[PDB]
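Researcher: Batch entry, complex prediction.
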Amino acid sequence: TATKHLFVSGGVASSLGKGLTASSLGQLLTARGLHVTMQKLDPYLNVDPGTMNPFQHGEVFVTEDGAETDLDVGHYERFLDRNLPGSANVTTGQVYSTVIAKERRGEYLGDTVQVIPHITDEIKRRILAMAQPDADGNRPDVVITEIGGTVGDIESQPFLEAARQVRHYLGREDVFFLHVSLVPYLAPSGELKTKPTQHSVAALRSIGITPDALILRCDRDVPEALKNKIALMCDVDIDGVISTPDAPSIYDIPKVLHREELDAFVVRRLNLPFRDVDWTEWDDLLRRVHEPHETVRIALVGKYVELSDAYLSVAEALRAGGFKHRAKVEICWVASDGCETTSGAAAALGDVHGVLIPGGFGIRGIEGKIGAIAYARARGLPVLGLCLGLQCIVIEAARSVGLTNANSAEFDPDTPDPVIATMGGTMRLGSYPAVLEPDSVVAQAYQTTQVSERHRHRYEVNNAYRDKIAESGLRFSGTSPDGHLVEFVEYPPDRHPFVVGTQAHPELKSRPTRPHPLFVAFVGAAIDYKAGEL
Amino acid sequence: TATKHLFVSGGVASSLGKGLTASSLGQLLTARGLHVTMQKLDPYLNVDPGTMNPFQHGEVFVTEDGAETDLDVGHYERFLDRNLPGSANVTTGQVYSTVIAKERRGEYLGDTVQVIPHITDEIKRRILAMAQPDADGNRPDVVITEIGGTVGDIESQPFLEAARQVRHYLGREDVFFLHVSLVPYLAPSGELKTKPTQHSVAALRSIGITPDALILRCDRDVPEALKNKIALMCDVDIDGVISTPDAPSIYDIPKVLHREELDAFVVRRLNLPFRDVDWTEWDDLLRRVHEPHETVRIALVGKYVELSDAYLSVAEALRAGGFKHRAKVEICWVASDGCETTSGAAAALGDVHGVLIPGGFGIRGIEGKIGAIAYARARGLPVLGLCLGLQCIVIEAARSVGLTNANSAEFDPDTPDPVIATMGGTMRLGSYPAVLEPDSVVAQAYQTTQVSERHRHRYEVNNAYRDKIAESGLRFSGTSPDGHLVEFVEYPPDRHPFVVGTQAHPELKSRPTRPHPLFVAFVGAAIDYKAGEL
Amino acid sequence: TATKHLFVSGGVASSLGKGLTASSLGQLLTARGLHVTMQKLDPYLNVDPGTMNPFQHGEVFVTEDGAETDLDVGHYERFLDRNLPGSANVTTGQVYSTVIAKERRGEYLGDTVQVIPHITDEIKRRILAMAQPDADGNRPDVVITEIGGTVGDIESQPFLEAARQVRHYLGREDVFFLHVSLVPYLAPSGELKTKPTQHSVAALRSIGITPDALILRCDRDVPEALKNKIALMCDVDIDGVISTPDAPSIYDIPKVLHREELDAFVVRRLNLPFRDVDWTEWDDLLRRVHEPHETVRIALVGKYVELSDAYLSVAEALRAGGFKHRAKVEICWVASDGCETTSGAAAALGDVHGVLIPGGFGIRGIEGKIGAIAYARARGLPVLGLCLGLQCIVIEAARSVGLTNANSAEFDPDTPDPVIATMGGTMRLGSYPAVLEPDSVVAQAYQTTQVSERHRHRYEVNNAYRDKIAESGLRFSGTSPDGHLVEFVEYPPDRHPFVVGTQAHPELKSRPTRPHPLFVAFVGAAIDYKAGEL
Ligand SMILES: Nc1ncnc2c1ncn2[C@@H]1O[C@H](COP(=O)(O)OP(=O)(O)CP(=O)(O)O)[C@@H](O)[C@H]1O
Ligand SMILES: Nc1ncnc2c1ncn2[C@@H]1O[C@H](COP(=O)(O)OP(=O)(O)CP(=O)(O)O)[C@@H](O)[C@H]1O
Ligand SMILES: Nc1ncnc2c1ncn2[C@@H]1O[C@H](COP(=O)(O)OP(=O)(O)CP(=O)(O)O)[C@@H](O)[C@H]1O
Ligand SMILES: O=c1ccn([C@@H]2O[C@H](COP(=O)(O)OP(=O)(O)OP(=O)(O)O)[C@@H](O)[C@H]2O)c(=O)[nH]1
Ligand SMILES: O=c1ccn([C@@H]2O[C@H](COP(=O)(O)OP(=O)(O)OP(=O)(O)O)[C@@H](O)[C@H]2O)c(=O)[nH]1
Ligand SMILES: O=c1ccn([C@@H]2O[C@H](COP(=O)(O)OP(=O)(O)OP(=O)(O)O)[C@@H](O)[C@H]2O)c(=O)[nH]1
Ligand SMILES: *CC(=O)CC[C@H](N)C(=O)O
Ligand SMILES: *CC(=O)CC[C@H](N)C(=O)O
Ligand SMILES: *CC(=O)CC[C@H](N)C(=O)O
Ligand SMILES: [Mg+2]
Ligand SMILES: [Mg+2]
Ligand SMILES: [Mg+2]
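Model: Structure tokens for the complex:
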């Protein structure tokens, strides 16, 4: 049948969890054998999130095709176990620059270029593009489009109008509206309130959209009497009124939605091929999530100590590495600035079982990350470095063999030894192939000598320093196919059981149901270190 | 005191006449000795109206500084008798491209770039820029900002939010909101309806704006009982409820607003220096408008026969030329396509007293305009050619002396004689100086040999053909100061009493209270032709 | 099938003609063989319109069962040719007093009595009651419910909410929403505007109602391009976008709606039994409306004659009387106060062909109505008196025979001769039987001696004065079955060709397709007077 469009909107307030609810619905539909693709509409004017501070706004996700996207695409890829195109993230910035650029070229042939229909046609074009056959030739069954911003706000109006037009042009049989609302609890009276959902749905209806179902985000179960009140006042089928209480883990959200039979309601309402959910893969994940056999502590040596969306894909990849070993990864958020000195690094990393040095696109404090690697090497702690992490492993190795002032030309342009430098240079974005040295730590982890990983960097290992850096025992165990670019570094296992660096972001290809081989090997080495210390 | 901001919004429906009401208020405040400047906020995405078809969307106005703007700037200049900057026209296209370009350069330093505050800050910046001292050093007393689009529509939301923020930041003492509404008449019941104004004001209030006054656009006088109902339901001072019935001429609108004492209400509400209106100049204009001593028929040989906004400044300049002679100019709208043949041109121009060949930026049908000039020359009819008009006078002169296939390379790239060609070339926009031949028709009209006029063209008279074209008797009576570019052409008065062409758009510098010298001389020649035919 | 509910709402402004559009649709569906009943929901607090000044708010219609209702019930009866129950008019006043009375008796059993659901349940009950089998045992096919007030106003909110709940409970298959909007014309630009319809439909959608069709009230045909714009922006089937221009006569509206195929769209959308319209009866009416063979002038001697709805059923009955004779009745609206003196009555009634003295519930000036009858008797003008009219005929007869101070005790309680008096008394409402004198003017008009007419009065002919009044020649040609109450009066044809009075309101039983026998005889006598004057 025709590709179906399922729009996810939000009401009352932001940060209710629309993205994770949409992803969980995507997981449930995928588990029913449906081909699901997902898309995020971001009402911000940044053409891409590359200009945003990730320490304030969250990580930048990078797709296989090299697009810098909102972190939500990461949630979609993790719940669908699918590579999404750069088209899966639409911003107001992209839409307006595209339309204005076409206007300047005279492509609208003398027309007054307007929000309606020219801006809404562009958004609609980007929504409908998701229903085109992919590279393998497959057309999706369902396109889940998450509409960023809140209903009733100015910024979301062109997106919501485009979604209303998609419904008008494709008909009610091919389009479904899911609206996420808040049911707050008032502690003095002890009651849940439906009034915000009532008003939010009236604002949604006022812009021409009739919700087919409602996600009632709450800190508790929404009683049947409240669901009945909402069904009546909002004119939503009672089977489409979904009590969605805060879940203990993000992996529990599909079970919350399935208990309320939201996915079965969606399949019936869109007249999609029906098949029962195959719970094999997700039940296996939930056993690894809720029933670990051991705990392991990993230091994430980033900008700060607060649990951060700036390292979301890294944190998820670490946990997934744990799941593979039926282990619980406890992340010790360590501020890199505190690891600069040997006593500072000892106080911060003395009780961990592994040290992860993550990526740091646009950051400035590097001496703390180098300090953490120097401590971990001496302590015998496993190390996994990602992009900036590999660069810090390379800088620390060069300094350990006499190049005292070795650095990246990015962080010290006046360094006499730029062991990390541009090839200014070439920004490497998206998937790049690498060839691994057979029997190396990285080749043993991947169980192959030919791999591909996603990149986001313009600084590379300076090849003029390979022989000098190798004096530390560090091996260039992975390179580009022509051998010019260093892609992976590692110490021999007889010197350090696990010290590995990668120029790429393997965390982006990690899934909770498909852990990344490097994170599996890293967590495995951390479990080994813990057992050796007992 | 502080520069005041007066915002003009529209409700119920578009095309009510907001621009002319704002201009008329601008005239009334100017006549009270206040320094008034005006600005139009256009919600369209066209960075400038240059890509719009003027035959569908109206003429492009060109300012002294060379900006291509909405025709509304023309209304402002005509009612204020002032040159306005390119900043007097803000479009959504300009705002979004400026903000997106700053975002791409990293000027927002890691911020999420949003409609609020980044888009609204840019609009607010453009509104507040109008309050800066001009080139002569003068700061305006009042900035009248017309908000395009209708209240309740999506496209106007960022502009209205910016205006609300201007009020918030400057205070109620420095900001005034004027809302234009429709009071429709229902013929079966014979009654006027206030309900649309009631609902429009509630929509305006819902976005945070309280109107200080209301323009009640109607086909009849709004009775006191209806004004009282509106004052009460909309909470507007009865002195700010303005009955604005459709006026016989646009020049009558200041008298309609003054009778209702809107300008006195505005001056008192904004605590502006009070002075009575000096009616000397406007009463003089109204006597020329309503009490002409003679009538004269002028053919406007444009694309079509319907009264058009595509030639608004030309039509206004023709009427102003008439006012100077205490004459009524009757415009005979003649489709150029019908003047290609000698019999067609005779049928179309046989009963007129003058022929105006207007500008035609982006048009295709030129043979009809050349045909009209050939007929007018043989008939002894006065001719005034503007931009394309001069080019058509030059082409017709070249063909009359044997260059049968003479043309502009714009309309016939394969012409063996490109008498009009690029210097591709250089687009000339805005004010350019010209030096006139003393005792020429053009120098006698201007009463000076040094002039400046506004341009909008890239094709010029090909200097290689000057000697050949002059064989017709045509004189290059005006040039650029270095003598390289032809700016004016004319025939000797002994051959044709008035056949003049200009590369510029003198109509743009015309005002109803200050007619342009070329239009005064042209209409004067048309009055002479009429009298000679009696 | 199930009884269908068709709701008629209004937007933009009041007095657009919702009632006549609904009635015309009722006529079209009746002509397709459907059993249609109609109901008006009035948002005013008057329990019945009896306390309203009819000279400000329009006539009070009286049903067979004696309910005093809004004049709209009259339009319904005239277009359906059916007697409607008192239940066909619901007011806010009725609903709130019913619910408050139930609350005071404890019928809500400890509940908080609320607008939702208690007021809306009462309105819904009154809407659904219209679908119950009538006295003959027949259940209607369609109930057309007109919702008074304008969408977006406070007063209509409970009615609109009840209609939304009827849709929710019965489903989309049994409920249809028709929304009436205004398409205004802007004379300076010459354009029709769709913006008010766009905004009105968004307000209707915001309160939970999706219109199935739109009535576009306009002073001209709405072009296809504007209908296409509305279909797209309002998301209404193009087949349901109805151009409804101002019609020359109210009886032309069914043809306007049929041309746009609204009735066929309604029948298909509600899955009603389909049958073609039988145009026999209505085409016959339209020939009498548009092709009269003669014109006749009738004075309507009302207390206050603005040309208002205060005498709507009288004016319609006069026209229907004309139709029967293939004549056009021109109503000369005459203020009764000007007919008090014989010279005043001569100036006012000198050029008419008949004099109608209508009912005057709540009036104070009766001397002018008596003066008009005295003039008409002397002039030989036909007279038809309704309720107060009969009473004035009786008072004038008594005074013409020497009872100089004869009057009604209603207008002069101190009269020594109350020829009109109570039995205080008994208010007679609705249908009452009368027995007519065989071979009397009234029996010859009705062509029967047994009739029934609707009443609205408490004053009667004082039987103690029958012998004295009869001295004038006046006959008591119609009485109650027991002979106690005077129902009809007339002069013998050998004294006056046509001077008739009735205590009732025969105009209420008049239909354009079924003229009332008294109005047929009256207009016939007026045609005779005109012919005798030539
Ligand atoms: N059902 C649920 N229970 C608990 N936490 C939840 C949740 N749904 C979402 N979250 C939390 O919300 C966080 C942010 O993701 P979310 O889905 O809320 O984005 P969003 O759509 O509301 C905002 P934006 O569009 O700016 O990205 C997740 O990291 C997760 O921890
Ligand atoms: N009071 C009035 N009486 C008669 N005509 C009037 C009028 N006010 C305006 N008009 C007419 O309206 C025409 C268009 O100018 P107007 O002021 O209506 O623009 P606007 O602000 O409504 C639309 P936009 O923003 O797209 O330019 C004028 O050419 C004039 O003839
Ligand atoms: N198509 C049409 N052509 C001409 N006149 C029309 C018309 N439709 C309605 N009218 C006129 O409009 C007036 C108001 O009609 P109507 O009673 O139906 O309006 P309404 O329903 O808005 C008032 P209420 O609020 O009292 O119910 C009447 O004088 C009627 O004759
Ligand atoms: O009327 C409005 C208000 C706000 N916005 C948009 O809201 C966006 C901010 O998105 P948020 O959801 O964070 O709103 P908030 O900060 O105002 O309130 P909190 O829930 O965070 O406490 C901004 O990007 C702005 O464009 C509108 O579009 N319209
Ligand atoms: O909800 C809406 C509808 C329309 N619009 C905006 O209205 C603009 C069109 O401006 P108009 O005033 O011409 O509206 P219209 O054509 O829809 O109706 P008419 O009055 O002309 O009959 C378009 O440029 C669009 O962006 C909104 O911003 N929001
Ligand atoms: O927002 C509002 C305004 C008014 N009303 C209600 O409107 C009713 C008056 O109804 P009208 O339609 O007569 O309004 P109006 O007189 O103000 O304007 P026009 O006729 O000129 O169009 C009153 O009974 C009042 O309660 C609302 O319910 N809500
Ligand atoms: C990828 C990473 O962690 C840092 C990127 C840095 N700016 C670069 O190496 O180019
Ligand atoms: C100015 C005018 O009328 C036409 C401009 C034309 N395109 C040109 O000469 O460049
Ligand atoms: C019936 C009428 O209109 C006036 C008569 C008066 N109210 C009465 O007889 O009670
Ligand atoms: Mg999200
Ligand atoms: Mg304007
Ligand atoms: Mg009605």
